[PDB]
Design a protein around this ligand. Structure first.
Ligand SMILES: Nc1nc2c(ncn2[C@@H]2O[C@H](COP(=O)(O)OP(=O)(O)O)[C@@H](O)[C@H]2O)c(=O)[nH]1
Ligand SMILES: [Mg+2]
Length: 144
């Protein structure tokens, strides 16, 4: 038990709704991680205050959504400066190989520098989409 709220943030057309699509403008489901149960609610300023974890999604095929991550992250951390926020940077569209603008290594480097987790996903194909919402659950538990 325990209720976990997870927020999806990022520029338009990076895949927020599609990612929430694979889980379920909110989606509520009872899931199981490392052999225990939890209700996870995925949301696609009162947002800032109630969120347990934040998924900052960019498209790996869109370099303008990558560059905007640092500022999105800092505005967010500024919203609760006393809090240690669990944050995952989600490199979506990992399937469009020939359209890529952002490598795995720059994305990983971005994450470490900024103290978040990193994961690449394809929401169109449900690749790493289960691990994404699972990693979210794990970070939130650590904060409890
Ligand atoms: N190839 C590919 N297309 C995707 C992926 N995720 C989303 N899209 C497409 O990109 C467009 C925008 O997705 P959407 O969820 O509306 O983005 P939003 O603006 O964050 O809500 C739609 O055409 C999606 O089908 C992905 O992982 N791979
Ligand atoms: Mg949308």
């Amino acid at each position: 038990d325990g209720v976990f709220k997870v927020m999806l943030l990022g520029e338009s057309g990076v895949g927020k709704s599609t990612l929430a699509g694979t889980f379920g403008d909110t989606y509520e489901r009872r899931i199981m991680v490392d052999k225990e149960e939890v209700t996870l609610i995925v949301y696609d300023d009162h947002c800032l205050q109630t969120g347990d974890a934040f998924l900052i999604v960019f498209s790996v095929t869109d370099r303008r959504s990558f560059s905007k991550v640092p500022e999105t992250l800092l505005r967010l951390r500024a919203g609760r400066p006393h809090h240690d926020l669990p944050v995952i940077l989600v490199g979506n569209k990992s399937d469009l190989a020939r359209s890529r603008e952002v490598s795995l290594e720059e994305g990983r480097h971005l994450a470490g520098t900024l103290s978040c987790k990193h994961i690449e996903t394809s929401a169109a194909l449900h690749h790493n989409t289960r691990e994404l919402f699972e990693g979210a659950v794990r970070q939130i538990r650590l904060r409890r």
